[PDB]
Design a protein around this ligand. Structure first.
Ligand SMILES: [Hg+2]
Length: 315
């Protein structure tokens, strides 16, 4: 029965309503990925929304390949977010920081290093750089040390989020970035614990999630997933083999909520779940499920009313 105007809770986060502002990568931060004063206003305007998820924010330079994106590994960065975050709260808002490791979707001319991924692969297309576009470089496959470091940067990133004042964190595990790369058999060829069976493709996610929930609480922790990707075109043959278990695990670990990004209804009047994911995921994940599609309001108001999701994302 709920509507977009009804309250909802994300763990301890008492969201005023069921709208989620989840911005695309504005890209207006400085070259050291420190937020800037414009960003205060950009975020403060969106305070009316039940909850705000930030633009995806780097946990590490290695993982941040997008020019002028912000991050949150540094003390400087934390200090910059602070006023931005407090701006939002002043206006009675809620806001949660989105944790990005781009994986293989970066260029070493920006990260200063070779792209890292679950396995040594090369993404298709070109990549943006402060010098304009370029051929993707092959990646190198993460090893145990790397993993331990990456895991470090995620935990630090979350902790730093809470230091700046975020009401929580969302682990970005979606859109063919680093965690996604591990989950997909096509991007993951490892023969260690982290590869092979579905249960192993899942391990990397588990381990990231575990650190984070250990660090600030499963009740302040969300994950974003995107089985058919972030874009018109793709359709995962059998998303129940990995993604459902993924979700089941997230339930069990205590995770507060789950955004599920899915390239948006194809007509105007075209269907909401087309790919009928939510019912599969609802089967195993019982807390709030956010659907993020590129959505007209009427469309949103629908899904929510049709039971498909508990709140809806826009940007
Ligand atoms: Hg994205």
């Amino acid at each position: 029965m709920p509507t977009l105007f009804d309250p909802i809770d994300f763990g301890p986060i008492h969201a005023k309503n069921r709208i989620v502002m989840s911005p695309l990568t504005r890209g207006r931060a400085d070259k050291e990925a420190v937020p800037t004063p414009i960003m205060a206003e950009y975020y403060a305007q969106r305070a009316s929304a039940g909850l705000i998820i930030t633009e995806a924010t780097g946990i590490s330079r290695e993982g941040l390949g997008w020019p002028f994106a912000p991050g949150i590994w540094s003390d400087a960065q934390v200090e910059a977010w602070k006023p931005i975050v407090a701006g939002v709260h002043a206006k009675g808002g809620k806001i949660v920081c989105q944790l990005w490791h781009m994986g293989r979707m970066v260029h070493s001319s920006v990260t200063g290093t070779q792209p890292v991924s679950s396995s040594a692969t090369t993404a298709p297309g070109e990549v943006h750089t402060y010098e304009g576009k370029k051929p993707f470089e092959q990646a190198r496959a993460i090893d145990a040390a790397d993993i331990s470091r990456i895991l470090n940067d995620y935990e630090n990133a979350a902790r730093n989020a809470i230091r700046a004042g975020f009401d929580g964190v969302q682990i970005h595990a979606a859109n063919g970035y680093l965690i996604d790369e591990f989950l997909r058999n096509g991007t993951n060829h490892r023969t260690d614990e982290y590869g092979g069976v579905p249960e192993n493709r899942i391990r990397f996610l588990k381990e990231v999630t575990e650190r984070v929930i250990a660090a600030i609480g499963a009740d302040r922790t969300g994950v974003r997933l995107s089985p058919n990707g972030d874009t018109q075109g793709c359709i995962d043959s059998a998303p129940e083999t990995v993604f459902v278990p993924a979700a089941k695990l997230l339930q069990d670990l205590g995770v507060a909520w789950l955004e599920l990004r899915e390239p948006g209804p194809n007509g105007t009047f075209g269907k909401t779940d087309q790919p009928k994911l939510s019912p599969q995921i609802r089967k195993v994940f019982l807390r709030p499920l956010v659907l993020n599609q590129d959505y007209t309001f009427e469309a949103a108001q629908t899904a929510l009313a049709e039971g498909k999701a508990d709140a809806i994302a826009f940007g």
